[PDB]
Amino acid sequence: TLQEFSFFDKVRRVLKSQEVYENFLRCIALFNQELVSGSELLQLVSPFLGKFPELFAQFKSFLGCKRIGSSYRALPKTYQQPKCSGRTAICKEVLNDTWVSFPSWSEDSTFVSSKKTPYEEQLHRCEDERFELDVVLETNLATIRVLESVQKKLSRMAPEDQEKFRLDDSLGGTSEVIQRRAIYRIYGDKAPEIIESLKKNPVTAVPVVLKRLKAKEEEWREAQQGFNKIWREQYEKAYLKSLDHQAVNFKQNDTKALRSKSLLNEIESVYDEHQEQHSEGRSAPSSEPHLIFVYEDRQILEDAAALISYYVKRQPAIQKEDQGTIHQLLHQFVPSLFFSQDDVYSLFFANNNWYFFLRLHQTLCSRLLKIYRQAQKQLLEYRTEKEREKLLCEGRRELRLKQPSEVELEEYYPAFLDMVRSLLEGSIDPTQYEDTLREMFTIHAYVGFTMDKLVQNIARQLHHLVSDDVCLKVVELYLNEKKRGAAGGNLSSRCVRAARETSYQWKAERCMADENCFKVMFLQRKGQVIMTIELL
Amino acid sequence: GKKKVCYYYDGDIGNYYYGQGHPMKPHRIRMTHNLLLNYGLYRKMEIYRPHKATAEEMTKYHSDEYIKFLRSIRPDNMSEYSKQMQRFNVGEDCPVFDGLFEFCQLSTGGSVAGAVKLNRQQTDMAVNWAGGLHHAKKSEASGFCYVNDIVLAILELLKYHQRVLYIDIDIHHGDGVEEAFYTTDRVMTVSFHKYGEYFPGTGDLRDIGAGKGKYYAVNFPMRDGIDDESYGQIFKPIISKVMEMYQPSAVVLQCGADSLSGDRLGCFNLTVKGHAKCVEVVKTFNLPLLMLGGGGYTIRNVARCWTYETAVALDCEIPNELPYNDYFEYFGPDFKLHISPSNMTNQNTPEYMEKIKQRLFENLRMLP
Amino acid sequence: SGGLMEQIQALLAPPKTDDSCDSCKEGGDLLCCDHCPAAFHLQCCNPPLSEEMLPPGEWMCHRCTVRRKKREQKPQLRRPFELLIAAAMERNPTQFQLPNELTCTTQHELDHNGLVPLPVKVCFTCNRSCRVAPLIQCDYCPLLFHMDCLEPPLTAMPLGRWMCPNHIEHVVLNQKNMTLSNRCQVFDRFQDTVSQHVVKVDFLNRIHKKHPP
Amino acid sequence: PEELKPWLVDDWDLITRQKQLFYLPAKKNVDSILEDYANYKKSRGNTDNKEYAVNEVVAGIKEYFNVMLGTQLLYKFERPQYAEILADHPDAPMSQVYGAPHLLRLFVRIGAMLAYTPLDEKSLALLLNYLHDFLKYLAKNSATLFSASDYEVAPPEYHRKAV
Ligand SMILES: [Ca+2]
Ligand SMILES: [Ca+2]
Ligand SMILES: [Zn+2]
Ligand SMILES: [Zn+2]
Ligand SMILES: [Zn+2]
Ligand SMILES: [Zn+2]
């Protein structure tokens, strides 16, 4: 009947593609070939209609040597299994004897430059350099201790039997090879005659090897002191830089993602996404925004605005009346948009440039917010660290570096502001700038290296915003529309003012038609304000 | 509350040399023990000398030809065994060195002695950081492991325990241990491991077991850059349900420390506190427990992690400042117990976690 | 590049005292002939060259051997079979190669600078573009699927030809005991059969009837 | 000019794609199968005096399976197999042990490899005919004789031994 025809038209519409519809008709034809059961028919249908509940329900109502796993596979039945002499009843009854897996890779593979920073391979190299001394020196010390014990033993009975005393392969120790290894290393090629000598006549051989080993271990210990002094000045130059795995990439990715074309494409992609969904006819209302952002402080807004003012006030390229325009704009109207001067919203129809600047402003606020949270978190962890460590019995419950005081940790944030301001002046080279930033804010400092570039880009946006007539037009249209009370207001009064809002929409279209138009919405809740922006 | 515990240390286990540039570097145990000693932990914990395991104990699982090869092989007679060396995967990856058979002897002896004492009910917790080598097979050496100590420990424990749980938290997959108990209902192998172009290349979602031991072998593939809280949120539920349904009598943990941040061959990003969260979680269920060693290649971090989880086993807390030790200069430049994680991107996105966890839950619901 | 390795090893020194095979076209351990640049594997010789067999000195290829020895020298089917055996003796141990008649037969990524391409193509399960996560395009149909959107989700990149989960051949791959060729013929049975709209729709309303005829 | 070849695709997949090896002493060695063909075909014609050529060509298949094996008949995964065969039972019949599936590879090669030996027209015609009916008898009872179910696999030791 026509219900089936409607189902097929709508499945064609929601599949958007001929080949997948071919696959679907393949499945149903295979089922018609009676090679597929109804439950099986549905287990092959579900990949097609696993996200449209209505169509899936409609279709359901309409109807009314082996190998396992991925790596385990069989041994030959007539395979001579390796015999074992310790097999008990459990060994036969529990152990596998039919299934085998294969190691697909090998350890220590090509991983040197896969995901590791250049400052970590250095630490790995120093680690190996340290270990080889540690092992050789400690083998020598262990051999010294063992032969010392055997000598302390030997010096205690009558001399008529000392020539009868002998030493075994272990050199008197618990390990057969450790002492022999040490002697080989000490003596080069002439070691084994001496090994025979201390095995045959220990009484005349123990003191001489003991003396030579003593001198050698003191020489190696002094060399170790020198080497360990040299080894320092190296962990300090790599540890913090090794913990950061994103900075080198992040510089380029942020300096590339802040271009205007990227900011445009990020929302055009969402527009085309929702357009394709709308063509599909899927269950989604035609009022849901495209991009949502959030500010969770007002003081951070004042800080960011202060920073932008601080940059622009020291420029040569913009004149004093434009400085006044910029001050008026940033410190009065943008707070006006945010209602800094629940369920209260403000609307704003903006051109391309306004979208650009105001997204950059959101990014700056978010960066500063992450910095603030990390500083506060550091303070709390350090305070609770003193609290926990002060009351601690250590084992009774049966040099170094000076950490900053709480005052400095609390002073971190304004100091960071002074530092970024200074970087904007440029009197502080970015190199020790980033060194200082990292040394304060550990692994979370990766976000704040490119703040200067962002601030200068925002300043260019502001200069263009004042210079271009379309922006000023947009702003005074917003002003008179707020005077009428049409633009923005109470959530309840949305149904009352939808008509005047729609007229405002019409004005925005007729004003900026040859360019992409944006809608921006500022809704306030529990002290935080949520950006919502969408395209038109 | 506080309970008795045992520790087996043979002072020579650190002296063996795998070869120049070999990431398997057995020094780690020696610094672990020294750090424990200078933390004053030995007053509350008993330290024992492990008896060297006889080859008869090793043949209980391994092929006699393999053990003969292991005992007869030396660096000086490489020529006279090349055919067998190729036949037994001994070479570049797993090399022959001085006293390798002694090292394997000690490694297996520690854990087997722990298992004997555990079976006797003389203690409910024993530690052996030398053992836990899990990549060794029935008749081959792989993944820097020669004699699969854990399987011998489990075979010893089964003499008195009806059901036992094996937990692997190494970045690698315990391929040998699971393959040994692939087809049995007496053991579950719960492995959390990174998958994808990674050694050994086994350990999918659906490697779920076989025969009577079907549904009795759960794996958890992960991606790069797993972090602390993600691991915590995924561990406690899976473990709580596994030991609610299975109700085992003994538990064995492989604390592979190669899952830490900044490892030489690892990609994970766990911290020492996050790593010890697992041992607190498993112990809180109050069952007899065996802790074994395994991986761990960033030697300072390995020492830190093993020391901390040992101290957790005693229910003892230790100052974040490291006390003085013979290898103090390794922990520069901060010289602190806990390590700060790196900041690389976590590819283990939350919905992936939710889906894998749900599939595991469904698979476990089938256990009788 | 100041490495400490050389000095430390010299300080601990004991005293002591004073590109591809020509036969199989694949790499590995190769021996290169000293008259021609061609190289052969240790098992690419007639008879195979074992480790203990190689003579001390220069190595010669089989083709160079034949050339050198030729220069130095300068209805019964029994005769055809002798011809065949002589020819087989002359042949080189390269490989057995299947006939080509049987063995034979970008846009969804960020730009070079990094940017979402336009127009966009979206994950089938979410209708979301490449921005959220990398997109995997099926090699049989132009369907793109996410990493975490399948069931069960993949952990790692499928290095080979991925098989999308919408396609039907999964029910054919379920069997673990049948031969490859049967599976291949079943696959190819659906790889050409298209444009059957009327017959499948008719069968569907045929089966739809609640009361069988 | 070969028929019902898709069995070769299965052989290729199990040998060098599924990494599943063949049984060394599986059953029905190639010379034994050739003797079975000779016995079966002798009871076809009422008076096959041409048995003097039938047996000769069967033995020719034997001799060509003698020296050609190993050179350009096996796959790169099959080098260790041939090495073990040559090192374990060299004095034993080398044209034995190896099962039927390796036989078809010889004929697959020979169809192109013959293009370097200029035989006379009648002889090549007869050889073509005998290849044809040999292969049609093989296609007749392939399911009975060819069996991919009993195909063991290679543990990683054989993987190291191969490459
Ligand atoms: Ca694991
Ligand atoms: Ca099991
Ligand atoms: Zn070759
Ligand atoms: Zn040559
Ligand atoms: Zn998706
Ligand atoms: Zn597909």
Contact D68 C80 (CB under 8 A): no
Tell me the CB-side half-sphere exposure of residue C192, using CA atoms within 13 A.
5
Q: Are residues A181 and A39 in the same domain?
A: no
Task: Please answer whether residues A441 and A375 qualify as being in contact, where contact means their C-beta atoms are separated by less than 8 angstroms.
Answer: yes
Cis peptide preceding A103, ω within 30 of 0: no
Say whether residue D155 is in contact with chain A using an 8 A CB cutoff. Answer: yes
Q: Are residues A491 and A511 in the same domain?
A: yes
Note if B135 is an active site residue: yes
Closest CA to A97 of B174, B69, B191, B213: B213
DSSP labels, A430-461: HHHHHHHHHHHHGGGGGGSTTHHHHHHHHHHH
d(CA A289, CA A519): 9
d(CA A28, CA A1): 17
Check residue D20 and report its DSSP letter.
B
CA distance D125 to chain B (A): 50
Task: Please answer whether residues A253 and C114 qualify as being in contact, where contact means their C-beta atoms are separated by less than 8 angstroms.
Answer: yes
- Residue C12: both structure tokens together: 């601990």
Task: Please answer whether residues B230 and B206 qualify as being in contact, where contact means their C-beta atoms are separated by less than 8 angstroms.
Answer: no
- B181 assigned ligand-binding residue: yes
d(CA B214, CA C176): 17
DSSP labels, C78-135: HHHHHHHHHHHHHS--------HHHH----SS--SS----SS---BTTT---TTTS--
Task: Please answer whether residues B259 and B227 qualify as being in contact, where contact means their C-beta atoms are separated by less than 8 angstroms.
Answer: no
Q: Are residues A214 and A263 in the same domain?
A: no
- Show the CA angle centred on residue B349, arms to residues B346 and B353, nearest 5°: 120
Say whether residue B318 is in contact with chain A using an 8 A CB cutoff. Answer: yes
Task: Please answer whether residues D16 and D162 qualify as being in contact, where contact means their C-beta atoms are separated by less than 8 angstroms.
Answer: no
Q: What letter represents residue B95's amino acid?
A: P
Collect all residues of chain D within an 8 Å Cβ-Cβ radius of residue B85: none
CA distance D46 to chain B (A): 57
Backbone angles phi, psi at A109, to 5 degrees: -80, -170
d(CA D101, CA D8): 8
Q: Are residues A50 and A139 in the same domain?
A: no
- Residue D91: both structure tokens together: 């004095």
Q: Are residues A297 and A221 in the same domain?
A: no
Breaks in chain C after (C-N > 2.5 angstroms): 18, 74, 105
Task: Please answer whether residues B204 and B195 qualify as being in contact, where contact means their C-beta atoms are separated by less than 8 angstroms.
Answer: yes
Residue A529, in any domain of the structure: yes
Task: Please answer whether residues B246 and B161 qualify as being in contact, where contact means their C-beta atoms are separated by less than 8 angstroms.
Answer: no
How far is residue C120 CA from its own chain's centroid?
32
Q: List the end-to-end C-alpha distance of chain C, in Å, as a whole number.
A: 87
Q: Please count the other Cβ atoms lying within 10 Å of the Cβ belonging to residue A379.
A: 15
Nearest CA in chain C to B196: C156
Domain of A24 in residue numbering reads as: 2-63
Complete edge-to-edge strand list for the sheet that includes strand A99-100: A67-68, A72-74, A99-100
Closest CA to A362 of A424, A308, A294, A302: A294
Task: Please answer whether residues B311 and B41 qualify as being in contact, where contact means their C-beta atoms are separated by less than 8 angstroms.
Answer: yes
Contact A102 D150 (CB under 8 A): no
Place of tokens 């050409």: C192
Task: Please answer whether residues A96 and B184 qualify as being in contact, where contact means their C-beta atoms are separated by less than 8 angstroms.
Answer: yes
Backbone angles phi, psi at B355, to 5 degrees: -70, -45
3-state class (DSSP) for residue A67: strand
Closest CA to B198 of B223, B179, B219, B177: B223
Collect all residues of chain C within an 8 Å Cβ-Cβ radius of residue D127: 77, 80
Collect all residues of chain B within an 8 Å Cβ-Cβ radius of residue D161: 86-87
From residue A93, give the alpha-carbon distance in Å to each of A66, A87, A267: 22, 10, 63
- Known binding residues of C: 21, 23-24, 41, 44, 123, 126, 138, 141, 146, 149, 164, 167
Q: What letter represents residue B127's amino acid?
A: V
Q: Which residues contact A7 (CB under 8 A, 6 or more apart)?
A: A55, A58, A59, A62
Contact A65 D151 (CB under 8 A): yes
3-state class (DSSP) for residue C72: helix
d(CA A208, CA B133): 41
Chain C stretch 114-173, residues whose beta carbon is closer than 8 A to a beta carbon of chain D: none
Closest CA to A217 of A133, A126, A148: A133
Breaks in chain D after (C-N > 2.5 angstroms): none
d(CA C146, CA B63): 46
**Domain closes at, from A43, A63, A83:** A63
Q: What is the CA radius of gyration of chain B?
A: 20
Contacts for C95-98: CB closer than 8 Å, 24+ residues apart: C95/C23, C95/C24, C95/D72, C95/D75, C95/D76, C96/D72, C96/D73, C96/D74, C96/D75, C96/D105, C96/D108, C96/D109, C98/D8, C98/D12, C98/D108
Alpha helices (H) along A281-350: 299-312, 320-328, 334-337
Q: Are residues A426 and A370 in the same domain?
A: yes
d(CA A73, CA A96): 12
From residue A338, give the alpha-carbon distance in Å to each of A344, A349, A350, A364, B57: 10, 15, 15, 16, 76
Signed CA dihedral, C167, C173, C178, C181: sign only: positive
Please give, one letter per residue, the 3-state secondary structure of chain B: CCCCCEEECCCCCCCCCCCCCCCCCCCHHHHHHHHHHHCCCCCCCEEECCCCCCHHHHCCCCCHHHHHHHHHCCHHHCHHHHHHHHHCCCCCCCCCCCCHHHHHHHHHHHHHHHHHHHHCCCCCEEEECCCCCCCCCCCCCECCECCCHHHHHHHHHCCCCCCEEEEECCCCCCHHHHHHCCCCCCEEEEEEEECCCCCCCCCCCCCCCCHHHCCCEEEEEECCCCCHHHHHHHHHHHHHHHHHHCCCCEEEEECCHHHECCCCCCCCCECHHHHHHHHHHHHCCCCCEEEECCCCCCHHHHHHHHHHHHHHHCCCCCCCECCCCCCHHHHCCCCECCCCCCCCCCCCCHHHHHHHHHHHHHHHHCCC
Backbone angles phi, psi at B183, to 5 degrees: -120, 40
d(CA D21, CA D16): 9
Closest CA to C117 of C105, C125, C129, C126: C129
A/B interface, count of CB pairs below 8 Å:
228
Instruction: Tell me how far the alpha carbon of residue C117 lies from the centroid of ligand 6, in angstroms.
Output: 22
Contact D156 A103 (CB under 8 A): yes
Counted domains in chain A: 3
Backbone angles phi, psi at B285, to 5 degrees: -80, -10
Signed CA dihedral, A167, A170, A174, A179: sign only: positive
Contact C155 B221 (CB under 8 A): yes
Closest CA to A529 of A308, A346, A341, A329: A346
Residue A244, in any domain of the structure: no
3-state class (DSSP) for residue A60: helix
Q: Are residues A212 and A345 in the same domain?
A: no
Backbone angles phi, psi at B270, to 5 degrees: -70, 155
Task: Please answer whether residues D151 and D17 qualify as being in contact, where contact means their C-beta atoms are separated by less than 8 angstroms.
Answer: no
Say whether residue A262 is in contact with chain C using an 8 A CB cutoff. Answer: yes
The domains found in chain C, sorted by start residue, are 19-105 (3.30.40.10), 126-193 (3.30.40.10)
DSSP labels, A72-99: EEEPPTT--PPP-TT--HHHHHHS--SE
Nearest to B299 among A70, A111, A127 (CB): A127
Cis peptide preceding C165, ω within 30 of 0: no
- Residue B76: both structure tokens together: 């000086």
Task: Please answer whether residues A465 and A353 qualify as being in contact, where contact means their C-beta atoms are separated by less than 8 angstroms.
Answer: yes
CA distance B136 to chain C (A): 25
Nearest to B352 among C51, C153, C159 (CB): C153
Backbone angles phi, psi at D130, to 5 degrees: -75, -35
Nearest CA in chain B to C132: B349
Catalytic residue among B134, B135, B173, B193: B135
Q: What is the largest distance, in Å, between two alpha-carbon atoms of chain B?
A: 57
Closest CA to B261 of B317, B344, B336: B344
How far is residue C176 CA from its own chain's centroid?
22
Q: Are residues A150 and A56 in the same domain?
A: no
Per the document, the length of chain C is: 213
Q: Residues C193, C197, C198, C202: what is their CA dihedral angle, to the nearest 10 degrees?
A: 100
Which residues are registered as beta bridge partners of A438? Answer: none
Chain D stretch 103-142, residues whose beta carbon is closer than 8 A to a beta carbon of chain C: 105, 108-110, 112-113, 116-117, 119, 122-123, 126-127
CA distance C78 to chain D (A): 7
Q: What letter represents residue A407's amino acid?
A: V
Collect all residues of chain D within an 8 Å Cβ-Cβ radius of residue B63: none
d(CA A501, CA A486): 6
Which ligand sits nearest to residue B213's alpha carbon?
A: 2
Backbone angles phi, psi at A367, to 5 degrees: -60, -50
Q: Which residues contact B242 (CB under 8 A, 6 or more apart)?
A: B165, B188, B190, B218, B364
Q: Are residues A372 and A229 in the same domain?
A: no
- Known binding residues of C for Zn(2+): 21, 23-24, 41, 44, 123, 126, 138, 141, 146, 149, 164, 167
Q: Please count the other Cβ atoms lying within 10 Å of the Cβ belonging to residue A408.
A: 11
**Domain closes at, from A23, A41, A63:** A63
- Resolution of the PDB structure in angstroms: 3.7
Task: Please answer whether residues B97 and A172 qualify as being in contact, where contact means their C-beta atoms are separated by less than 8 angstroms.
Answer: no
Contact C77 D123 (CB under 8 A): yes
Instruction: Tell me how far the alpha carbon of residue C179 lies from the centroid of ligand 3, in angstroms.
Output: 30
Say whether residue D17 is in contact with chain A using an 8 A CB cutoff. Answer: no
Annotated domain spans of chain D: 1-163
- Residue A201: both structure tokens together: 């006549």
Task: Please answer whether residues A94 and B186 qualify as being in contact, where contact means their C-beta atoms are separated by less than 8 angstroms.
Answer: yes
Nearest to A124 among B264, B320, B330 (CB): B264
3-state class (DSSP) for residue A528: strand
d(CA B217, CA B205): 10
Residue A178, in any domain of the structure: yes
Say whether residue B107 is in contact with chain A using an 8 A CB cutoff. Answer: no
- Residue C100: both structure tokens together: 């080509």
Q: Please count the other Cβ atoms lying within 10 Å of the Cβ belonging to residue B285.
A: 14
Category of A15 on φ-ψ map: left (φ > 0), alpha (ψ -120 to 50) or beta: alpha
Closest CA to B36 of B321, B304, B274: B304
Signed CA dihedral, A403, A405, A408, A412: sign only: positive
Q: Please count the other Cβ atoms lying within 10 Å of the Cβ belonging to residue D107.
A: 17
- B173 assigned ligand-binding residue: no
Residue A102, in any domain of the structure: no
Neighbours of B (≥3 Cβ pairs closer than 8 A)?
Answer: A, C, D
Q: Are residues A503 and A446 in the same domain?
A: yes
d(CA B68, CA B78): 15
Q: Are residues A160 and A235 in the same domain?
A: yes
3-state class (DSSP) for residue C34: coil
Q: Please count the other Cβ atoms lying within 10 Å of the Cβ belonging to residue B10.
A: 25
Check residue A116 and report its DSSP letter.
-
Task: Please answer whether residues B272 and A99 qualify as being in contact, where contact means their C-beta atoms are separated by less than 8 angstroms.
Answer: no
Which residues are registered as beta bridge partners of A100? Answer: A73
d(CA C77, CA D119): 10
Q: Are residues A228 and A309 in the same domain?
A: no
Experimental technique used to determine this entry: cryo-EM
Collect all residues of chain D within an 8 Å Cβ-Cβ radius of residue C187: none
Backbone angles phi, psi at D88, to 5 degrees: -100, -45
d(CA C80, CA C55): 36
Closest CA to C12 of B144, B17, B329: B17
